[PDB]
Amino acid sequence: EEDKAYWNKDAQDALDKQLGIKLREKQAKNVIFFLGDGMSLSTVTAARIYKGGLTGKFEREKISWEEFDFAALSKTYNTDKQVTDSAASATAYLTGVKTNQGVIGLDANTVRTNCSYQLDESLFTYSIAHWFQEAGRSTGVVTSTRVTHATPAGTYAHVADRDWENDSDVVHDREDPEICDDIAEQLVFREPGKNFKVIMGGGRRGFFPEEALDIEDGIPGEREDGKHLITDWLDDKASQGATASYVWNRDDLLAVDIRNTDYLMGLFSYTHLDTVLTRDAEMDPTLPEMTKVAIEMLTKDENGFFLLVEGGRIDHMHHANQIRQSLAETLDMEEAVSMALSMTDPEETIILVTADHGHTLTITGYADRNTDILDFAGISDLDDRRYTILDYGSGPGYHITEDGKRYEPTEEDLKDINFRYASAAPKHSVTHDGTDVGIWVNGPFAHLFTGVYEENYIPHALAYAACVGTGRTFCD
Amino acid sequence: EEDKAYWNKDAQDALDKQLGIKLREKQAKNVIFFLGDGMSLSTVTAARIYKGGLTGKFEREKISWEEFDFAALSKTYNTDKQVTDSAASATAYLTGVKTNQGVIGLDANTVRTNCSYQLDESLFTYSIAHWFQEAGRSTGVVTSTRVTHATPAGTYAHVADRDWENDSDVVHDREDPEICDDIAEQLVFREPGKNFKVIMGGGRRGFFPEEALDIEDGIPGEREDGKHLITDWLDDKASQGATASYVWNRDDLLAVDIRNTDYLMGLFSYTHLDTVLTRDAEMDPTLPEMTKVAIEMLTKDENGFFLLVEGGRIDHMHHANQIRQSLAETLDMEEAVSMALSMTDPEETIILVTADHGHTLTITGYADRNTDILDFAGISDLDDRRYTILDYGSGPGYHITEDGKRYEPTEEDLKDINFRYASAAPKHSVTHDGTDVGIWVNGPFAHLFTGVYEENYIPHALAYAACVGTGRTFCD
Numbered sequence: 001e002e003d004k005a006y007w008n009k010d011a012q013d014a015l016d017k018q019l020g021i022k023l024r025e026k027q028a029k030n031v032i033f034f035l036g037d038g039m040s041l042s043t044v045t046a047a048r049i050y051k052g053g054l055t056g057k058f059e060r061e062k063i064s065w066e067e068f069d070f071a072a073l074s075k076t077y078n079t080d081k082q083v084t085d086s087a088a089s090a091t092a093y094l095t096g097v098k099t100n101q102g103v104i105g106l107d108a109n110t111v112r113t114n115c116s117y118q119l120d121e122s123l124f125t126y127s128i129a130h131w132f133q134e135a136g137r138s139t140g141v142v143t144s145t146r147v148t149h150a151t152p153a154g155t156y157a158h159v160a161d162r163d164w165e166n167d168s169d170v171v172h173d174r175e176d177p178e179i180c181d182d183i184a185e186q187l188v189f190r191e192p193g194k195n196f197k198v199i200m201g202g203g204r205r206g207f208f209p210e211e212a213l214d215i216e217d218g219i220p221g222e223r224e225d226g227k228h229l230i231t232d233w234l235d236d237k238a239s240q241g242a243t244a245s246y247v248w249n250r251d252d253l254l255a256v257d258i259r260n261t262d263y264l265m266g267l268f269s270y271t272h273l274d275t276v277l278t279r280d281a282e283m284d285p286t287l288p289e290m291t292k293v294a295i296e297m298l299t300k301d302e303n304g305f306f307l308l309v310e311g312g313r314i315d316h317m318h319h320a321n322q323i324r325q326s327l328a329e330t331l332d333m334e335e336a337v338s339m340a341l342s343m344t345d346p347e348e349t350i351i352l353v354t355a356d357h358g359h360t361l362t363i364t365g366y367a368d369r370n371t372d373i374l375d376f377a378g379i380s381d382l383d384d385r386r387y388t389i390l391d392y393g394s395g396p397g398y399h400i401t402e403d404g405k406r407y408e409p410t411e412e413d414l415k416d417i418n419f420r421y422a423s424a425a426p427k428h429s430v431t432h433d434g435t436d437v438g439i440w441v442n443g444p445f446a447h448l449f450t451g452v453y454e455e456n457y458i459p460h461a462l463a464y465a466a467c468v469g470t471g472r473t474f475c476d
Numbered sequence: 477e478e479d480k481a482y483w484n485k486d487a488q489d490a491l492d493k494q495l496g497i498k499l500r501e502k503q504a505k506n507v508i509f510f511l512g513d514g515m516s517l518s519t520v521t522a523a524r525i526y527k528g529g530l531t532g533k534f535e536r537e538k539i540s541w542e543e544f545d546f547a548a549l550s551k552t553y554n555t556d557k558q559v560t561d562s563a564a565s566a567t568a569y570l571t572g573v574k575t576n577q578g579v580i581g582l583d584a585n586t587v588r589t590n591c592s593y594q595l596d597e598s599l600f601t602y603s604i605a606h607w608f609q610e611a612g613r614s615t616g617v618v619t620s621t622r623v624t625h626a627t628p629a630g631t632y633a634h635v636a637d638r639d640w641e642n643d644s645d646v647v648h649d650r651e652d653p654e655i656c657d658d659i660a661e662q663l664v665f666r667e668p669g670k671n672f673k674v675i676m677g678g679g680r681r682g683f684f685p686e687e688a689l690d691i692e693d694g695i696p697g698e699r700e701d702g703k704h705l706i707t708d709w710l711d712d713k714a715s716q717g718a719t720a721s722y723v724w725n726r727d728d729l730l731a732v733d734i735r736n737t738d739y740l741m742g743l744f745s746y747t748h749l750d751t752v753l754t755r756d757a758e759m760d761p762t763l764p765e766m767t768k769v770a771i772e773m774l775t776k777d778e779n780g781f782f783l784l785v786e787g788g789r790i791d792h793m794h795h796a797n798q799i800r801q802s803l804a805e806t807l808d809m810e811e812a813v814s815m816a817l818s819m820t821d822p823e824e825t826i827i828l829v830t831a832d833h834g835h836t837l838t839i840t841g842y843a844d845r846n847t848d849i850l851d852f853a854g855i856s857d858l859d860d861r862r863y864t865i866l867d868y869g870s871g872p873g874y875h876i877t878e879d880g881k882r883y884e885p886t887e888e889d890l891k892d893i894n895f896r897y898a899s900a901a902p903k904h905s906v907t908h909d910g911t912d913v914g915i916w917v918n919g920p921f922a923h924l925f926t927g928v929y930e931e932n933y934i935p936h937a938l939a940y941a942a943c944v945g946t947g948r949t950f951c952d
């Protein structure tokens with residue numbers, strides 16, 4: 001068992017590993033950036049124990065990126081709020097500049113929801129994907145959310161409001177769609193989006209009009225301007241002489257001919273992809289599966305590539321206090337990191353994992369070792385009712401019963417994938433959490449991430465290592 | 477303002493600092509270890525903002541130790557519980573071995589509360605202080621709690637139950653005080669305690685009997701065996717031919733003759749020292765003040781010293797969900813770190829800050845930048861009542877009013893130093909939080925702390941750098 005000699009050996013071996021670390025002071029050819037949306041440090045710890053329950057290692061289990069030698073902390077406050085949204089943070093960790101709540105790819109002069117600001121090129125911030133393109137290297141994005149969602153949008157878009165995924169959202173805020181480009185338009189018509197070799201995720205709805213119907217579901221599109229952007233995207237590649245494929249299910253994705261495919265657009269859902277615990281495994285590719293094809297495509301570029309992969313529905317589950325699903329989305333991303341590591345050369349590939357912001361998840365005591373992380377922790381000594389190990393500072397989990405008592409979770413509740421674990425402050429959708437989040441890095445110049453940094457530091461360091469952009473560079 | 481150019485420069489300057497880092501691969505003469513008891517990463521974020529509210533820098537403020545270049549995470553699960561207590565964690569980050577809940581300086585074979593296990597030397601784990609003393613170096617402890625509390629007890633005691641601070645606690649568990657040494661006895665009669673050059677904190681009560689009265693308060697002591705351990709401590713130093721001083725208030729501490737004082741015992745309270753916001757500043761020394769004198773005394777030793785400093789009441793305030801006080805305790809420690817840095821040479825002194833475990837504090841949205849961290853965040857969209865930025869996953873803050881609604885905090889509540897901010901799961905004392913905590917390190921071999929580690933790793937690394945102990949060593 002876990003006795004003196006055991007813990008002494010465990011520590012000495014970790015010390016030996018630490019002392020055996022070798023710095024990689026050489027250029028990064030590739031950068032793969034994983035983003036766990038709303039994946040607080042507490043989400044990681046919880047997810048680790050969750051994984052341990054599946055492997056029988058429990059609290060001794062390790063998350064794949066926890067094998068990396070470099071971890072760091074990231075300060076997420078933005079230019080007008082203590083607790084950032086996904087838009088302003090993505091602007092920060094992908095374009096290197098912090099900005100206001102709800103804004104993407106514009107600096108803090110921007111007044112949210114006022115489109116004029118997205119017409120002023122002087123306020124634009126440029127993404128690490130843009131910088132890779134300027135250096136003549138390939139780029140792509142993979143996510144479990146609509147591909148027009150704030151996080152992936154950070155790599156290409158410039159909007160005064162992140163809600164403007166399609167033209168109908170622009171119209172809804174009474175701005176002029178003709179001149180106010182929505183995110184979906186920017187992805188297909190403007191740089192850097194129009195040059196991405198790989199685009200995968202959900203959100204088909206934003207790419208064709210109300211008069212047209214969704215492949216798969218036959219749901220009317222959301223566009224109100226008659227544009228069929230998927231066909232525009234395809235026509236465009238064809239006119240360049242390149243080969244392009246649009247797929248919308250797993251079988252077709254897995255069937256794509258890697259060697260002969262220049263551009264790949266894979267949209268697997270009308271909106272966000274189905275959560276891990278609800279998806280049809282036959283029809284939807286998993287995050288690791290999307291990740292692997294992305295890397296196969298982008299890696300054909302002998303000068304390198306940048307790829308963003310987002311485990312995005314971690315956040316959505318947390319907003320509903322649906323912690324069981326949140327942990328399942330997190331492990332899907334954890335497995336995609338293992339997939340990426342198994343396919344790339346660490347002497348030339350940076351793999352970085354971080355979160356945009358956290359969520360108010362906490363891990364209460366005092367269950368025994370090996371207890372299922374989603375289980376009860378004990379019984380309150382104030383009201384004599386059960387309470388769970390996991391709970392929230394914020395969200396719809398707060399529940400006062402009809403007869404005026406604290407809602408007591410049951411066994412059935414715990415297994416219910418839609419059960420909302422208790423919060424301290426009721427809100428229809430949980431707020432994010434302002435606590436610093438983690439960064440974990442492997443590959444060239446991973447040692448640029450050792451201490452505590454502003455969230456916008458990230459891409460400046462990455463550009464230095466990759467030799468892209470107009471900042472200081474390893475190749476300078 | 478915080479515009480593009482401003483964030484670009486901010487990031488480039490942080491990059492320039494990172495690239496300028498120089499590794500210190502030399503022996504550590506001194507090691508100063510700060511322990512924020514119960515100081516979760518969320519506590520550190522919140523304290524940072526709390527500090528900013530005092531200085532006018534707000535979210536852009538920095539915690540002193542956040543200036544260190546090396547930060548890491550620490551996994552705090554122990555041998556029987558997911559969420560550790562202060563006893564088993566101190567055994568881990570001070571003796572290098574994880575152990576069971578409530579046990580100090582004995583391995584996991586120990587059945588808590590059963591004294592027999594504290595008679596078996598084979599089960600003993602030895603502290604970093606013990607290692608320093610075996611190498612011929614000085615040691616000391618400083619804390620805001622009773623000096624017999626679990627945290628400082630980790631540097632010297634071996635007990636089957638951390639409650640055994642004095643003999644009356646042993647008796648209370650129906651063990652035999654004659655053979656079961658309480659922690660106060662071990663501090664004064666056994667090694668390594670008996671050799672500490674400096675001992676500061678509270679807890680006088682455990683050092684003299686019921687028949688005797690406290691200096692200052694005249695409160696009867698807790699001992700039931702007639703022992704006057706303070707006089708035993710003094711007699712003992714005198715008989716070695718050394719000069720010793722016992723002080724119990726701030727003037728006397730500050731009046732101590734550093735050059736001619738070999739041993740210093742400073743007990744400033746009957747129990748735990750008064751919290752920051754309640755203490756009489758005339759009668760009680762602050763954490764930084766205790767820290768400075770400790771350093772002044774220990775640093776006379778040309779071969780080096782180890783010093784533990786604990787910001788201990790951080791925890792106690794969080795148990796009561798008294799977040800305002802918790803933050804104030806935290807900054808007292810933050811200031812002590814700055815004191816220690818100003819006093820020592822980083823080419824030869826390691827300064828390391830960490831926490832034993834966290835608490836279930838979360839930071840909710842969405843207050844504007846510059847809002848006081850202790851203020852309201854907004855109004856719930858479910859019950860139309862205010863909620864605070866800060867709240868808890870666990871504790872006594874949970875409050876259902878008489879008419880069966882969520883308690884709505886008022887302005888007066890916020891200002892009240894004893895107001896308990898809301899929790900999600902009511903409990904008389906909040907539980908600790910199982911989430912990984914931070915480590916931040918400066919000086920020689922600070923770069924042994926880059927990634928994610930088991931909590932017991934810490935002292936093994938520190939021993940290697942200081943060249944003490946029987947593990948692998950820089951000097952080997």
Ligand SMILES: *[C@@H]1O[C@H](CO)[C@@H](O)[C@H](O)[C@H]1NC(C)=O
Nearest residue numbers: 111112113114115116117120
């Ligand atoms: C939008 O911005 C422009 C200025 O560049 C301004 O004239 C207009 O009034 C703004 N709209 C609002 C409602 O703030």
Ligand SMILES: *[C@@H]1O[C@H](CO)[C@@H](O)[C@H](O)[C@H]1NC(C)=O
Nearest residue numbers: 587589590591592593594596
């Ligand atoms: C305490 O430990 C001893 C020694 O091995 C054993 O004889 C005894 O019954 C234990 N006490 C209890 C109550 O378990």
Ligand SMILES: [Zn+2]
Nearest residue numbers: 037038086356
């Ligand atoms: Zn987000």
Ligand SMILES: [Zn+2]
Nearest residue numbers: 037086151312
């Ligand atoms: Zn996202």
Ligand SMILES: [Zn+2]
Nearest residue numbers: 038315319432
């Ligand atoms: Zn969110």
Ligand SMILES: [Zn+2]
Nearest residue numbers: 513514562832
């Ligand atoms: Zn503690």
Ligand SMILES: [Zn+2]
Nearest residue numbers: 513562627788
């Ligand atoms: Zn303590």
Ligand SMILES: [Zn+2]
Nearest residue numbers: 514791795908
């Ligand atoms: Zn505690």
